[PDB]
Every structure is written in structure tokens, then in C-alpha cells.
Design a protein around this ligand. Structure first.
Ligand SMILES: *Cc1cc2c(cc1C)Nc1c([nH]c(=O)[nH]c1=O)N2C[C@H](O)[C@H](O)[C@H](O)COP(=O)(O)OP(=O)(O)OC[C@H]1O[C@@H](n2cnc3c(N)ncnc32)[C@H](O)[C@@H]1O
Ligand SMILES: *Cc1cc2c(cc1C)Nc1c([nH]c(=O)[nH]c1=O)N2C[C@H](O)[C@H](O)[C@H](O)COP(=O)(O)OP(=O)(O)OC[C@H]1O[C@@H](n2cnc3c(N)ncnc32)[C@H](O)[C@@H]1O
Ligand SMILES: *Cc1cc2c(cc1C)Nc1c([nH]c(=O)[nH]c1=O)N2C[C@H](O)[C@H](O)[C@H](O)COP(=O)(O)OP(=O)(O)OC[C@H]1O[C@@H](n2cnc3c(N)ncnc32)[C@H](O)[C@@H]1O
Ligand SMILES: OC[C@H]1O[C@@H](O)[C@H](F)[C@@H](O)[C@H]1O
Ligand SMILES: OC[C@H]1O[C@@H](O)[C@H](F)[C@@H](O)[C@H]1O
Ligand SMILES: OC[C@H]1O[C@@H](O)[C@H](F)[C@@H](O)[C@H]1O
Ligand SMILES: OC[C@H]1O[C@H](O)[C@H](F)[C@@H](O)[C@H]1O
Ligand SMILES: OC[C@H]1O[C@H](O)[C@H](F)[C@@H](O)[C@H]1O
Lengths: 576, 576, 90, 90
């Protein structure tokens, strides 16, 4: 470690790695710090799902996700346990216990909010869904010229998709995928369009997908090295970034205070450029601990002087979930082209089809798979082949249905995964609502209470706003019930429900972007530069100032690419 | 990869790494294959608990364990779900679904048996408890000379303890530890002795412990390298070892068939010496797939000709569990030396003690911690300091109490971890019973059904034997109820219970050791050599032929050290 | 119709459940394998606890129940008495 | 006749129950029969059902009816956790 770099990056998630990719590549001397540690294998920051073992046992991966989602703010617990032995010690009050945050109103929380501290951030376990936002969900990057704005976003999203290896063809030969997609597209037709979920992933074989991650964006190997002898990069894991140091004028950052969590030593690191990509909660925390905004419970009688919108206007999405069991209609449809005679398991049983009958509903490759499976596995009553991939189906957000949808199988199962129903029958439904930004919806940091890293404790003051946001959330639940029923009935144990607020982990608006600090009530401009500072940039979903339903990361990445263009335009690398 | 090594090792767990440590160190050309992948960070095969983040959030680590425990044999599920929508497809029978093994009698199973396929094996997530076995639990290594047997085991265990960095002093300054230990030792006195659990671990600070693993034994870095320029070792992850190839006479192994799970290619590797350390289930599987023992449902009318005891006499331990909530007696005892005046939170409140009163029950360092905590945290009603380490207490197996005990806090929590009761009050109790080896208790491999790696499906035919084993298991449950009550009453949600058979993951006896193949009904001799073979060795708990209650790994390691002495005595390394 | 039930209507569910006796219960096949090793266990899912061995569990009306008390089920019914329109009516 | 545990956290004045009842096509194959071997608690032939909801109109309407209750209920409020939309035991 040196005390001087060209660029310092706080966070090794996929947005920090967008900045590394762009800037290491442009010749800057870059250091990247992460509070978490390398724990994905020799491909640093890679997706934990990419082992042979997880892809042969995908039901286990939920546990890996749960193992690295550490709750942001837990209220004081008030459950009465009165079946204790009379000899057992019991307090006479519900006192502050077990890491609970006494500041947190339990009824104004995002209880499902969690953070991940590992090299690669949440991209080590994410679903890899990377939809574009349509105009309605998307911040403006050019004002008063919609066609130039569209052009700019197209160029940026195209680049982000290339970084993440986004595609829409990885599941095209799945029977289950097709079954679900084809049905939905017929029943709306074509008042809504359905497609494969855009996924940051490359299929390597019929049974293995290489899911993308931070590592796909930037490999996180120190440089110079043999592949990149004229580049300069260092990754420092297990280093808590605590404070950026402001000048008097609030026009420049003059250093970064860091804490080596192994040795315990503290240092101060100097950079020409400072990029905070610590996630939506933790960027905010680091800024509040550095004197931006206000520490402590918000107090209107003494509003913050520096970035007063920081931590206000926060957005998190409503999320509804169920699972379904495939209808008899759809299961029978799989084998609709077959002539089936006799009874499974007996001498006379056969299943045949005629390749190329124009009468066939399905093409030959489908009927071949189905025939083979039915004849070779007469003990099995379903016509779906055993290793058939899951559906990965969406109808994207539109004005008439202003929610994102993901229909398929998600590794992040909620609750006990029941084993009685055959998994080929099971389809997951997740619908994500957009949330209006509102000044009263805040993330703030205690002046008394600290987290496990001795940093000010995060506290939410949040409710879904009462008008359009809440109306749409309920409409969205209805929509998922109506849409799901086209495929099948609900799976007991996975009935339609709202998930805990913030379990969707799409928190935005915490350090939000706009044109004008005061008029747009925002913290960073369209280059992701903090207002008034020459050399401080924020990357991540916390920049998104709009009400959005789609998964935000591709949009956050796009904003980062644009930020890096600004840096390349205004800062000169040091000589090698 | 070469097609020729001096020694090939199948498995990178702590027993394979014992063989690597001994033999790489002795100058052999070693290759090690593991079916699983590197996923613990840059320290290959290291304990996953050793991140700063897990040790600040230890309640999350249960999920990491659950994420890599893949069930051995799951029976066909027969639960009736009859609240499905009438449109949903339903079969008319409980058919073979969702990876279930149709061979497995659900009532003769070890349902909690699981395997871990990752570099470092189960040592990437284990509790690190490494007790010695006393004579009563321990196989004989010398016959008819008890003092020479004791000497041999002492030397071997001392070496194994040095490899694992076993100690008994890591928790000596915990208030909770002391509270529990001191109470139990008074109440039995001294008809039973209590001590700290021997743990393979080194404390680095008051809040961080470096837990040992396979990596502690052998660092698993390829050699030659800068630290070890004259050593030769290669680790090949994601390589399924499928078969060892026997000569006609069954006197030598002539190669190892391997399957590269990334490329899909198959190869055959030649070694002077072959060591199978794939765990108790999977060593057996590999052997049955190579023509040892018998494939298919056991058939007494056609007993196996080659190693007929392989897969018979299997042992797994009964495990009882509860948690308790610390008694008022014991909580009051913590502060027994304090003079406490007024009421917490008010101006007059104070807590004082007199250092060195001979009347004090506790020494000054205890009273200091307690006083400071009480005065500095008057909102907290407990006298235990917030970062106080957990107890780690045992009374080892003895004739009058023939079970192992671990009393403390274990990361591998069973069930939902309730948050209402303060965690400083909570103590876990696990008691482990010894199981009589019995011919009828088998692990066998289907001739029809295969696992996820296309290898014969493991199937258990197991019941706890009806006489002494079952009698002791129930006595052991009673013992834990009686002993636990000295500390506190049971925690609702963690009432005393037997865990699922095989959840303790101490399976032994699958390829068991003895002096004489026929007379001792065994598979390997005291050098861990397979009877009749010159060049095949088996390492692991599957060698242990006795009824044991203590955690077996240190004993398995000891047997491996002795095996490696035999190899060093009989095989010459190739020139460098 | 007691004063007490109408002041505590949440308790009345228990009165209903107390007189709904299941018509046909299939043989139970749930595996309970956390029994003490000393406890007696059969080696099959045998006919137990009033189960009907004739009943295919997957072709059942598991929630069917009968009430044997003077007044029959009208001693606990909801008292909803709609007419059928032509379409539903013999 | 509440189904399941009656949660006490939500004020009861807020809570509204929804029950929707579907019509079932009569079908010869749907039977109630009586064992010639097994008897009930009164020594009378044991009742046994051989019943499935018929696969065409009955099942189609049942699922439509579930959708209807979800759409209609949402006019009043959102679902109560623990009482999510479900089919009851047949
Ligand atoms: C956990 C999760 C996440 C997503 C979905 C699934 C699940 C279960 N799936 C999903 C997501 N997003 C999508 O667009 N589509 C998908 O299908 N998920 C969210 C996505 O995963 C996040 O939006 C994305 O990673 C955010 O990227 P980031 O802004 O780079 O932030 P990260 O949280 O990934 O990484 C931040 C990083 O910084 C560190 N850190 C935090 N504090 C500090 C301090 N003080 N000093 C130094 N470093 C710090 C972290 O440890 C972390 O690695
Ligand atoms: C999971 C667990 C394990 C233990 C306890 C806690 C928990 C939750 N705690 C405990 C244990 N043992 C103790 O003595 N004290 C403790 O406090 N646990 C058990 C211990 O962890 C095991 O006994 C030990 O690792 C066994 O060592 P091993 O004999 O080296 O076996 P492993 O299972 O660790 O590693 C084997 C290895 O081989 C691989 N493999 C399997 N099949 C193949 C094939 N066919 N080809 C190639 N490689 C193969 C694995 O992937 C694995 O890494
Ligand atoms: C239990 C239930 C019932 C109804 C609803 C609510 C609940 C929880 N609410 C409901 C009902 N019906 C409606 O139209 N609207 C409502 O809102 N329920 C059903 C209604 O309760 C029944 O349809 C009605 O009682 C049937 O009347 P019934 O045909 O007279 O039959 P019962 O079952 O009431 O009484 C029969 C009776 O005969 C006896 N018995 C049976 N076997 C014998 C033999 N072998 N020998 C002599 N006597 C016998 C019984 O003991 C019983 O009293
Ligand atoms: O299974 C019931 C469903 O059947 C379908 O085939 C329809 F598309 C849905 O609208 C719904 O009527
Ligand atoms: O709390 C009840 C317990 O109290 C104790 O202090 C004893 F040691 C136990 O034997 C039991 O009597
Ligand atoms: O709360 C959402 C609901 O609001 C209502 O007032 C409507 F009547 C429903 O259709 C639905 O939109
Ligand atoms: O449960 C949370 C997740 O659900 C799905 O995987 C989404 F794709 C993620 O972005 C995230 O919201
Ligand atoms: O739950 C299984 C574990 O319990 C405890 O951690 C033991 F130490 C382990 O060896 C293992 O049995």
C-alpha cells in the first residue's frame, strides 16, 4: 500500500469494478478498498453459484445468500416468551438486546434491508437480471431533448450489457421456459409482450451457466501483471473506509481515512479522485460520518447545511411473491403431438409422434426430447425431461402495468422448500413496484449507537407513500394473482404475499442524482459528481432519483460509465 | 497434470492434507484431486469462519454450513398436499421425485447424513473440537500390550494436535465460560471432570479466533514454489475420481480413473501409491465402483468375495441437543462481590467492589470487567460484558458416562434462531453417544440409481442397535437434562431432543480397521493398508472400527500419520 | 346463542372443531425419525389411529366431517340460507 | 369458523373474511362407497371416497373463482398474513 494513488475506489462490487475497468484501462494508478474479504475462489469477486456442485444442487444456494445478508436495522424485540423455567433469569423490560437498534421505529422500517461485505459485493450472489429502464422509470441525462437522452442511455446501456455479458438466449431450449412464455404471450396477446429475462450470464453447456459478477466486469487481479504489464491496480481487502476529509470550502476531498481490520492500524490515503461505491446504505454512512448531511435523528429546526438532500427521498420497491404448480392443461399440452397407447410400464405401451406433421403444435426437437423421456422413464408421470432448465420469463414495466416481473425459478427461495411437489411443476412469481421519492422517507445515522464496525448505526424512517405508490402495489399483487393463474394454482406454503420491506434489495435515492442541487433536491449531478466538489464521485443505486420497478444495477452501471467519461476528461493519469 | 506421480491422493479434506503434509514433506511427487472447487479465499482450504465479517456476525454462519451439506440419501416423499387448486397437475402416486433415492427405506435411514464437496472438505466449516479417545473408544494399534498401545497413541495424537494447533486455553478469560464450567465442576465434584473443549484454533485478539482447517495442516499451494523449492505438489480441483483399477490378483492398484468436470475429459493417472481420503461415504462409493465389496442391494446368498466387510458394521452416533437460559442464581453470582446502591440510570447509582477482599468469590480482573460494564451500560440489566466469548465446556467420555459432551455455543444452530432472549444467557448442549458396530448396519450402493455425479447411489440400511447402544442413548438424554438444569432451564424452541440420525456427521466403520481381515471383520490393517493390496491406503473416520462418542477427526488424523510412516518405510520417492 | 359466546365469538371455532369428526382418514405416512433409539417403532406405515386403509389419500375428501348431536350440524352452522337460481337448481 | 391460528396483532375491526364456493359437475366416477371389511366407530361399514374435482369446467371455474376472490378482495384491502389466498381441504 502507498499513501498516494491517482484514483481510490471504496467498494469492490460491480459498480466499483465498473470504475476500475474504465480507469485502470485508461492508465490511472488505482487503489480499491473493500471492508470484506476474498472468499469466491481464485477468480476474485466471482459468482458463488458458478461451482459444479451448486449447479448440481441449486436448492442449497439460498443458504449462501442468507449467509451473507446482514440486516441493516433491527428493532428492539418485544416478543413475550413466558414458558421459561422459573429458575431462568429474565429482565423486567424489553431492553436493547442482540444487536438491535434502539433508534429504529419498528413500524417505519425496512426490515428486510441487508448488506453484503465480501469482495465482489452482492454480485457474488445476485440473480443477474439486467433489464433496461424505459423513460418512465429513468433519470434524465439530457434535459429538453428526449431523443438525445434516449441516444445517450442506449449507448451507455449497450456498453454496460457488454461488460456484464447480458443476453436473452440462454434458456431458449427449455421446455418449461417455453411452456410458460408461450401461454402468457397468448393470453394477453399482444397487449403485453413477454421475453426472456435479460441475464448477465453465458451458458457453457446444457447443465452449466457461468453467471456474471463483479469479476466479469473487472478481474480484480493486482496490476501490473503478465496480461496487463502497463496497468496499475491494487485491491486491499479487509480495509474499512471510515471518512473522506473535506477542505474548508467543501470543494475538494483531501484524503481517505482507512482502518486495516487485520493489523488494526489506521492510515490516511491521498488520491486525485475519490469514488465511493460502498452500496446505497454504506455510501451514505461514510458521507454522514465525514460531515455531509446531518448526524443523528433528523431535526427540521436545524436542517443540514452540506448536501441537505442526502438520505432523504429514499426509495425501495414493494415486492410480491408466490409460487405455482403447473396446470394439467399445460402439462398435457407438452405431449399434445404424441400418440400414446397402452399403460406405462407394460409391454404394449408406446409414445410416438410424426416428425413434420403440420398439425403438430411443437417442432421436432421438442417432441424428440418428450418422446425419449416418456419411453425411457415410464416410472415418471411427467412429460418434462429431468434436466430441463427453469423458465426465465418477464413482461417488462409499462405504463399500463407499472411493475417489473420475473417468472421462473430463483435460487433465493423464501421459506422452507417443500419437497413433496415435483420441482418441474413449480414456477416462481416475483413482481416489483415503483416507489415515489418523498422527502419524509429517510435513511439516517445515529449519533449514539454504532454498528459492528464502529460506524454510526443506520436507521430507516420509511413508509410506502400512501397515494400512487400504495395503489399500484396493491394493483400489482392483483396482477400477479391474475397472471399466475394462467399457468397454474398457488403452491401451498408459497401463497401470494408481500415480502418484508426491503428484502428486494433495490434501495435507491439515498444520494440521488439531478441537474441542480436545490431544484431537483439531489446530491450528485449527471456525471455522478458530488455538488460543489471537484474530485468526489458516488456510484450505485443510491444515485437513482426516480420511481423504478426494474432491477437497478444495469442502470447504476450505466451511470458509472458516464461518470468515468467525466473523470477521463478532467484528470490526467500519473506517469507509469 | 502428468499421467505419473509417486502418490495420488483422492480428497482435500483434513485427512488427505495429513497425507500431503507428511509425504510432500518427505519428498514424494504428489498429486491431489478433489471433486469440489477452491471457494475459501486465497488461503486454499481454510475455515470459512475466519473472516472479520463472520466473527462479527456469527449467527449467520449456520447458513454457510447448511449451504454445503448435501444429503446422502433422501427417501421418496409421501406427504399429502391436498389444498392444490383443482387445475394444478397432480400424479396419482408418490413417484420418485426431486432427487429421492427409491432404494432407501425411510425407516432405516441416516436422514441427516450429508457430504461436502469443496476444497478442504468439511474442515471448511467444522466446529474444530479435537478430543482424544480414551481406551474404551479407541481401536488397538498394538495387541496384548496396553502400555505400548497407549504410548503409540500418545505419540500420534501429540503430532496430530500439533498439526491442527489444538489447545485448551483460547476461552480462559470468558465470564460465561467460567460461569458454566465452575458450576458444573462443583456440582459433580469431582466424580466428573470438566475442562475446555480441546479446539483446533489460535486466538488472534479478544474478538477474533483463527479456526484451524485442512489449510492449517497443509497449505495446498502447488510446489515447487518459493517457500518450498524442492517439494512437488499439485492440487487438481473439480476432478471426480471414479475408479481405482485392480490387477487380476487384487494385489496392486494400477491406475486411477478421473473425470475433469470443467472440460468433461476423462483420464487415467498412474501412481506408486494411491490414498483414498474422500470421506466415509465416498471412499466406500469409489471402492464399490471399483469392484470391491458388492454393488446393489446386499444379498446373503451371494456374499462379496473381495473385502466382504466393506460397508458393513457402520457406526453413527446418537446426538441429543437443547439450549438453556442462564439461571438467576448464576447471573446473580457474576456480581456477587459487588456493592450495588440505588437504581440504574439515576444519580445515586453505584457499583463497587474491593480489590483483594479475601471474601471475594472472583478475582480482580473479573470484577473489573463486571463493574465497568454495569456502570457504563446502566440501560443493560445483565452483568456480563457485551463481547464476552461463549463457553466451550466438556466433560469427556468415561465408563460411568459413556458419551461425549459439548456445552457452549455452536455456530451450527438447529432451527430458527429466536431473537427475544439475550444471547449472553444462552448455552447449547450437545451430547454424542457411542454406537456398537453391527454387521447388519450397512452402507450400500445401487446398481440402478446414480447420484448427481453419475456414481452409484448411496443407500443406508441402519438402525441404532437395540441393546446397549439404545439404552445408553436414552441414558445420555437423561444425563443432558439433569446436567443442563444446573445451569438453567430449557429455551423454548430448543427443548431436549434427538437430532436426525446422522446429522452429527461422525459416521465411521465403513471401511474399518483391524488386525486380521477375517477375524476382526475389517478392510484395512493398522497401517491403513487395504488387505491384500501393496499400494492402496484408506484414510478417514471410515477406518474407525470401535463404538466412539467423541468427535473422530483427530483420531482419523492420527491413524493417517501412522499410515504415512508405513509409506515412508516402503516406497522411495522419485528423483526431483 | 349463549351470552358468553356472543361476548367471546373467537372461541366458537373450538366448539365447531369439537364436533366435526372426519369421515375418511387415510393411512399416515409421515416419517418421524427424531425418536429416541429406545422407543418402539414399526418397520412399516401400518394401519393406525382410526385410519381407513381403503382410502386412496389422493382421491379423498379429507375435510369431510360429520356431526353426531341432537340438531345435527345446525347446532353450529353459519346460518347462510341463499336460494339457488335456475342454473344451480334441480 | 376460523381456519388456522387466530392472530391477535391486527385489530379485528380491520379484518374481513372471504369465502368463495364453486359448483362441481356431477360425474359417475365420483363416489362414496362403504367397505365390506373395515367399520367405523359405530360398527357400520366404513365410508370411503373416490373423488377428484372433474378436470374441465369444474376445475377451470375453481381457478377462475380463486382469481375472482383475489381481484374482489383487493377493493377492500390487502391480504392478512397467515390467511393468504388458498384452497381449503376438499
Ligand atoms: C443479494 C441480492 C442482490 C441482488 C439480487 C439478488 C440477491 C439475493 N439480484 C439482482 C440484483 N440486482 C440486479 O440488478 N439484478 C439482480 O437480478 N441484486 C442487487 C445487486 O447485487 C446490487 O444492486 C449490486 O451488487 C450493487 O452494486 P454496488 O453498488 O457495487 O454495491 P455492493 O453492495 O454490491 O458492493 C459494495 C461493497 O462495498 C463494501 N463496503 C461497504 N462499506 C464499506 C466501507 N465502509 N469500506 C470499504 N468497503 C465497504 C462491501 O463490502 C461491498 O463489497
Ligand atoms: C460439517 C461439520 C463437520 C464437523 C463438525 C461440524 C460440522 C457442521 N464439527 C466437528 C467435526 N469433526 C470433528 O472431529 N470435530 C468437530 O468439531 N466435523 C467433521 C469433520 O469435519 C470431518 O470428520 C472431517 O472433515 C473428515 O475429514 P476427511 O476424511 O478428510 O473428509 P472430508 O469430508 O472433510 O473431505 C473429503 C473430500 O473428498 C472429496 N471427494 C469426495 N468424493 C470425491 C471423489 N469421488 N473424487 C475426488 N474427491 C472427492 C470432497 O469434495 C472433500 O473435499
Ligand atoms: C358444521 C358446518 C355446517 C354448515 C356451515 C357451517 C359449519 C361449520 N354453515 C352453513 C351450512 N349450511 C348452510 O346451508 N348454510 C350455512 O351457513 N352448513 C351445513 C348444514 O349445517 C348442513 O347442510 C345441514 O345441517 C344438513 O342437515 P341434515 O340433512 O338434517 O343433516 P345433519 O348432518 O345436520 O343432521 C343429521 C343427523 O343425523 C344423525 N345420524 C347420523 N347417522 C345416524 C344414524 N345411523 N342413526 C340415527 N341418527 C343418525 C346425526 O347425529 C345428526 O344429528
Ligand atoms: O386454469 C384456469 C385458467 O385457465 C387458462 O387456460 C386461462 F388462460 C386462465 O385465464 C384461467 O381461466
Ligand atoms: O435451579 C435448580 C438447580 O439449582 C442448582 O443450583 C443445582 F445445582 C441443580 O441441581 C438444580 O437444583
Ligand atoms: O388499493 C388498491 C385498490 O384501490 C381501490 O379503491 C380499487 F377499487 C381497487 O380496484 C384497487 O385499485
Ligand atoms: O429476493 C430479492 C431478489 O429477487 C430476485 O432474484 C431479483 F432478481 C433480485 O434483484 C432481488 O430483488
Ligand atoms: O451438528 C453437528 C456438529 O455438532 C458439533 O459442532 C460437533 F462439534 C460436530 O463435530 C458436529 O457433530
Amino acid at each position: 500500500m502507498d499513501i498516494k494513488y491517482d484514483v481510490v475506489i471504496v467498494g469492490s462490487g460491480p459498480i466499483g469494478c465498473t470504475y476500475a475497468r474504465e480507469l485502470v484501462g485508461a492508465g490511472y494508478k488505482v487503489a480499491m478498498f473493500d471492508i470484506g474479504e476474498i472468499d469466491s475462489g481464485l477468480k476474485i469477486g466471482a459468482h458463488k453459484k458458478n461451482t459444479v456442485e451448486y449447479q448440481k444442487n441449486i436448492d442449497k444456494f439460498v443458504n449462501v445468500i442468507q449467509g451473507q445478508l446482514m440486516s441493516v436495522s433491527v428493532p428492539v424485540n418485544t416478543l413475550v416468551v413466558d414458558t421459561l423455567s422459573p429458575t431462568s433469569w429474565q429482565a423486567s423490560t424489553f431492553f436493547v438486546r442482540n444487536g438491535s437498534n434502539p433508534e429504529q421505529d419498528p413500524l417505519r422500517n425496512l426490515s428486510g434491508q441487508a448488506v453484503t461485505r465480501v469482495v465482489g459485493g452482492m454480485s457474488t450472489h445476485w440473480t443477474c437480471a439486467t433489464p433496461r429502464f424505459d423513460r418512465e422509470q429513468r433519470p434524465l441525462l439530457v434535459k429538453d431533448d428526449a431523443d438525445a437522452d434516449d441516444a445517450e442511455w442506449d449507448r451507455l446501456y449497450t456498453k454496460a450489457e457488454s461488460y456484464f455479458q447480458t443476453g436473452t438466449d440462454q434458456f431458449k431450449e427449455s421446455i418449461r421456459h417455453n411452456l410458460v412464455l408461450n401461454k402468457l404471450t397468448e393470453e394477453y396477446k399482444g397487449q403485453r409482450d413477454f421475453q426472456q429475462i435479460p441475464l448477465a450470464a453465458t451458458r457453457r453447456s446444457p447443465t452449466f451457466v457461468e453467471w456474471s459478477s463483479a469479476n466479469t466486469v473487472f478481474d480484480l487481479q493486482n496490476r501490473p501483471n503478465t496480461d496487463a504489464p502497463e496497468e496499475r491496480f491494487n485491491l486491499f481487502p479487509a480495509v474499512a473506509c471510515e471518512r473522506v476529509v473535506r477542505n474548508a470550502l467543501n470543494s475538494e476531498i483531501e484524503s481517505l481515512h482507512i482502518h486495516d481490520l487485520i493489523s488494526g492500524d489506521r492510515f490516511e490515503i491521498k488520491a486525485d479522485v475519490y469514488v465511493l461505491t460502498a452500496g446505497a446504505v454504506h455510501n451514505t454512512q461514510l458521507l454522514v460520518n465525514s460531515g455531509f448531511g446531518q448526524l443523528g435523528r433528523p431535526n427540521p429546526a436545524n436542517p443540514p447545511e452540506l448536501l441537505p438532500s442526502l438520505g432523504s427521498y429514499i426509495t425501495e420497491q414493494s415486492l410480491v411473491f408466490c409460487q405455482t404448480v403447473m396446470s394439467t392443461e399445460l402439462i398435457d399440452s407438452v405431449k399434445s403431438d404424441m400418440t400414446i397407447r397402452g399403460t406405462p410400464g407394460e409391454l404394449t405401451y408406446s409414445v410416438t409422434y410424426t416428425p413434420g406433421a403440420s398439425t403438430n403444435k411443437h417442432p421436432d426437437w421438442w417432441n424428440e426430447k418428450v418422446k425419449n423421456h416418456m419411453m425411457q422413464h415410464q416410472e415418471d408421470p411427467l412429460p418434462i425431461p429431468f434436466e430441463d432448465p427453469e423458465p426465465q420469463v418477464t413482461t417488462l414495466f409499462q405504463p399500463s402495468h407499472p411493475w417489473h416481473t420475473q417468472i421462473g425459478r430463483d435460487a433465493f427461495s423464501y421459506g422452507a422448500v417443500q419437497q413433496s411437489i415435483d420441482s418441474r411443476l413449480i414456477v416462481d412469481w416475483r413482481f416489483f413496484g415503483r416507489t415515489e421519492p418523498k422527502e419524509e422517507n429517510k435513511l439516517w445515522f445515529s449519533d449514539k449507537i454504532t454498528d459492528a464496525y464502529n460506524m454510526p448505526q443506520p436507521t430507516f424512517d420509511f413508509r410506502f407513500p400512501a397515494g400512487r405508490t400504495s395503489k399500484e402495489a396493491e394493483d400489482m399483487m392483483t396482477d400477479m394473482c391474475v397472471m399466475s393463474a394462467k399457468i397454474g394454482g398457488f403452491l401451498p406454503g408459497s401463497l401470494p404475499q408481500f415480502m418484508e420491506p426491503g428484502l428486494c434489495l433495490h434501495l435507491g435515492g439515498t444520494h440521488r442524482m439531478g441537474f441542480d442541487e436545490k431544484e431537483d433536491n439531489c446530491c450528485v449531478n449527471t456525471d455522478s459528481r458530488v455538488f460543489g466538489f471537484k474530485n468526489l464521485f458516488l456510484g450505485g443505486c443510491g444515485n437513482i432519483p426516480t420511481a423504478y420497478g426494474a432491477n437497478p444495477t444495469l442502470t447504476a452501471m450505466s451511470l458509472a460509465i458516464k461518470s468515468c467519461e467525466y473523470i477521463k476528461q478532467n484528470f490526467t493519469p500519473s506517469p507509469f
